[PDB]
Structure 1
Amino acid sequence: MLPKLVITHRVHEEILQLLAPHCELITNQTDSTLTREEILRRCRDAQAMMAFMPDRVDADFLQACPELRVIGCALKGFDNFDVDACTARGVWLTFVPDLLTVPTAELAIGLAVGLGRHLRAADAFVRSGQFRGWQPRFYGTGLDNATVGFLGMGAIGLAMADRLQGWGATLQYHARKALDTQTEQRLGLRQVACSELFASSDFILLALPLNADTLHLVNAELLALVRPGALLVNPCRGSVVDEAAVLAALERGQLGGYAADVFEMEDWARADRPQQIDPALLAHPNTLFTPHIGSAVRAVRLEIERCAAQNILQALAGERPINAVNRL
């Protein structure tokens, strides 16, 4: 009787082969996301769960799954997992601290450039077959000589700052805690107040987790302070911004653009979670969107799955998992 491991989404064959000698595998080798009800059913007598972005684990889920020893998350932002409840029940919660960082930072910079330069409309125009040569059109905003503000300066904030080093921009950030002097000085980063960040940045790049303190942090009040025409890029979590306030800011022309890889409709732990992205936001010309593909780099996804798998195996062997989010 090997301990039962429920894997909620498809995994590489290499990962199944890695886990097989140690676990009874209850797998979902399809392209689909299963219902919460079905996931809960599978986990009833499970000793381990490998969880992904669409998964949500609350105190009630854990209570109904009394044999769970570890939830190994194949992600960085564990906002949909009740860590406190995991700890109270003696359940390890693990994440993937580094592997998602660089692919997400690359995408965020791609979105900043694409948004500033009208990539969406530009490509549509060429693809229409109507291109006849250069025109005095599609004039946009570049990074050279601009001020770029980072909200949050953890892994992704740092990775984005690294990647903007040759770009002729003035870099500033707001964080809860100051970056160490050497890193600040290396990256040419200046620490500013949150309001100052919004008032003086031409590009605003969000790099915050979603928690109680950051929920709707980017609200109407804060957006009212932005330089007219400022560009906002959200590769972190949807609910860090109030998308309705963002749309309003775009429509009044105070916000020059919004680019996002993440959306409020994805934040399952919210009882009042928006069920869709507002069609008016989707239709706005000053936007650029991606469907949570921040870590969707082909080579990286096997490594992410492997990280989660190794953490799960450590927990099942009675070790402290290397990437445990909590302490028991």
Structure 2
Amino acid sequence: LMKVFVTRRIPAEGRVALARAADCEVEQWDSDEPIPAKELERGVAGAHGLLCLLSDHVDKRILDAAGANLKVISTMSVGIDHLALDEIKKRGIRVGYTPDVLTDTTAELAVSLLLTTCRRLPEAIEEVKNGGWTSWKPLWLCGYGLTQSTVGIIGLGRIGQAIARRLKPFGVQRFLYTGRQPRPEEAAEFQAEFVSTPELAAQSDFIVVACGLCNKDFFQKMKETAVFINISRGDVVNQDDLYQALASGKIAAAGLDVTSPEPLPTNHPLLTLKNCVILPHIGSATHRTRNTMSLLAANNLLAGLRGEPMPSE
């Protein structure tokens, strides 16, 4: 029997997998709220394996607390920059994470966020409830359509490719993309042209970061009728610059699944704007996906605690 600590109540499919392992003795923080460092720094002590969430920061400070005794840390996220991973890939400890399995879902949410923003749905929902809807009106609540539009994707990775793929049949006539290295073969499916950052800001009607670059200079160069979407990290957006551009007309509207910090305080300037949709990082929030993440995180942990190779390391 081996010591296994899980930081949070995880979706069933991962819990079942771990419950079926006669191999381990699993101790669980039976709560939906993120366990604080104080309880985590006694939780991991003497643990061969730990299953932890995006919330938890695993550092030289917690890795010591665990000691040589820990062989595997499995995290239930594609996101990596919360684990000290070069103190880790350090101690010869093996790391688990959950990529690819959330791709279609996040790219779906990105498009869902994009659509809801440009077609002005939240504002539309509110007018119905507040009494703004009086009749059918020709020029009322008009949005911006994807037909004959130019879309720019900052970060044409596996995730961004899934975005263009979904946007293609919406009558998009031109895809533009930018990044560190140009991707030739994966761009040909949508005929995505590789351009400079200024050019992408200048030409695009919609901009999606699928990766702080996105600041005042970037927002000035954007079309006044353009829509800006970000699903990657919060720290790529300069949030004061975003507020200033949205409030003064430099850009039409913005949609954010990620923010600085997370969560955003309820009294944040961006939340006082009607042309700014904010979501609480729901990119991968579906039953199917959260379950598969759970199970993929569970199998990674077990594979490591035993000695086998992993599905995702």
TM-score under structure 2 length normalisation = 0.93
Pick one of 294, 299, 305 that aligns with 2:283. 294
Residue 264 of structure 1 corresponds to 260
Secondary structure of 2:187 counterpart: helix
Residue 252 of structure 1 corresponds to 248
Residue 317 of structure 1 corresponds to 306
Shift of 1:131: 2.5
User: How many residues are treated as equivalent by the alignment?
Assistant: 308
Secondary structure of 2:252 counterpart: strand
Pairing 1:241–2:231 present: no
Shift of 1:64: 1.8
Pick one of 80, 87, 91 that aligns with 1:78. 80
Contact 1:263/1:277 (<8 A) preserved: no
Residue 213 of structure 1 corresponds to none
Residue 24 of structure 1 corresponds to 25
Secondary structure of 1:132 counterpart: coil
Counterpart Cα distance in 1 of 2:82 and 2:42: 19
Secondary structure of 1:16 counterpart: helix
Unaligned runs of 5+ in 2: none
Secondary structure of 1:302 counterpart: helix
Shift of 1:275: 6.8
Letter in 2 for 1:259: G
Residue 161 of structure 2 corresponds to 158
Counterpart Cα distance in 2 of 1:229 and 1:320: 50
Spell out structure 1 runs of 4+ moving beyond 3 A.
Answer: 274-278
Counterpart Cα distance in 1 of 2:278 and 2:150: 22
Pairing 1:7–2:9 present: no
Aligned residues: percent identity?
32
Secondary structure of 1:41 counterpart: helix
Pick one of 193, 196, 211 that aligns with 2:196. 193
Letter in 2 for 1:127: K
Residue 116 of structure 1 corresponds to 118
TM-score under structure 1 length normalisation = 0.89
Pick one of 141, 144, 160 that aligns with 2:144. 141
Comparing 17-26 with 253-262, which one deviates more in the overlay?
17-26
In the TM superposition, what are the counterparts of 1:85-104 in structure 2 within 5 Å?
85-104=87-106
Counterpart Cα distance in 2 of 1:224 and 1:278: 26
Letter in 2 for 1:118: R
Q: Deviations along 1:10-40, whole A, 9 cap, x unmatched?
A: 1234433322322221212322222122122
Contact 1:56/1:81 (<8 A) preserved: yes
Contact 2:12/2:294 (<8 A) preserved: no
The Cα RMSD (Å) is 1.8
Counterpart Cα distance in 2 of 1:22 and 1:287: 50
Counterpart Cα distance in 1 of 2:307 and 2:292: 23
Contact 1:15/1:306 (<8 A) preserved: yes
Contact 1:92/1:315 (<8 A) preserved: yes
Shift of 1:162: 0.9
Contact 1:265/1:277 (<8 A) preserved: no
Q: Deviations along 1:167-218, whole A, 9 cap, x unmatched?
A: 111111112122233x21112211111222122211110111xxxxxxx121
Counterpart Cα distance in 2 of 1:217 and 1:288: 20
Pairing 1:232–2:234 present: no
Q: Deviations along 1:99-144, whole A, 9 cap, x unmatched?
A: 2111111111111111111111101111235523211211111111
Secondary structure of 1:258 counterpart: strand
Residue 180 of structure 2 corresponds to 176
Pairing 1:59–2:55 present: no
Contact 2:14/2:298 (<8 A) preserved: yes
Letter in 2 for 1:59: K
